[PDB]
Design a protein around this ligand. Structure first.
Ligand SMILES: O=C(Nc1cccc(C(=O)Nc2ccc(S(=O)(=O)[O-])c3cccc(S(=O)(=O)[O-])c23)c1)Nc1cccc(C(=O)Nc2ccc(S(=O)(=O)[O-])c3cccc(S(=O)(=O)[O-])c23)c1
Ligand SMILES: [Zn+2]
Ligand SMILES: [Zn+2]
Lengths: 78, 78
């Protein structure tokens, strides 16, 4: 619905930890919504979550890893 | 399926990192299977994938944060 649009996902990232090594925008571009606790983010499509972001993580890489069959990660939204 | 039994999940943990702060028995108890990569474990029921385990982590608690609607976590398998 709304969260197919990158910008709407990005908007969920109010209060996202300023010091995270992986930026809010990178995480939204990788299909994530911010959960509002920690650096825990959750894909709008597959509903699978990822936390504990470290310098050098690929936001798309870790997503594919946890949800290789995610519709977003495999291009179902274009 | 067969992974409803704890013992069947625990079997998947050979060569799981011996220095893991969270033990193999503890993660199997929390519904996890070992993926065979690093300290990455996946839930047999909700396919959530969690790694980077640290001291103080609850296997169950972390599993519920990443998949609050997990069938395993919510009692589905009785
Ligand atoms: O399974 C899920 N998500 C999932 C499952 C059970 C519970 C939940 C869950 O707690 N969902 C929700 C959490 C939080 C929220 S929120 O706080 O309100 O925003 C949710 C909100 C709305 C809906 C959900 S929902 O319950 O997912 O419906 C939320 C999520 N996603 C998913 C979607 C598409 C593909 C994959 C995936 O890559 N799976 C797999 C991944 C990996 C493996 S592996 O063992 O490595 O071969 C799979 C193996 C066999 C089958 C699969 S399969 O069929 O693709 O599910 C494997 C995974
Ligand atoms: Zn996804
Ligand atoms: Zn689960």
């Amino acid at each position: 619905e709304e969260f197919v649009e990158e910008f709407n996902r990005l908007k969920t990232f109010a209060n996202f930890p300023s010091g995270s090594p992986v930026s809010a925008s990178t995480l939204a571009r990788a299909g994530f919504l911010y959960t509002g606790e920690g650096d825990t983010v959750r894909c709008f499509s597959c509903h699978a979550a990822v936390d504990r972001w470290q310098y050098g993580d690929s936001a798309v890489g870790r997503h594919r890893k946890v949800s290789p069959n995610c519709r977003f990660i495999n291009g179902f939204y274009l």
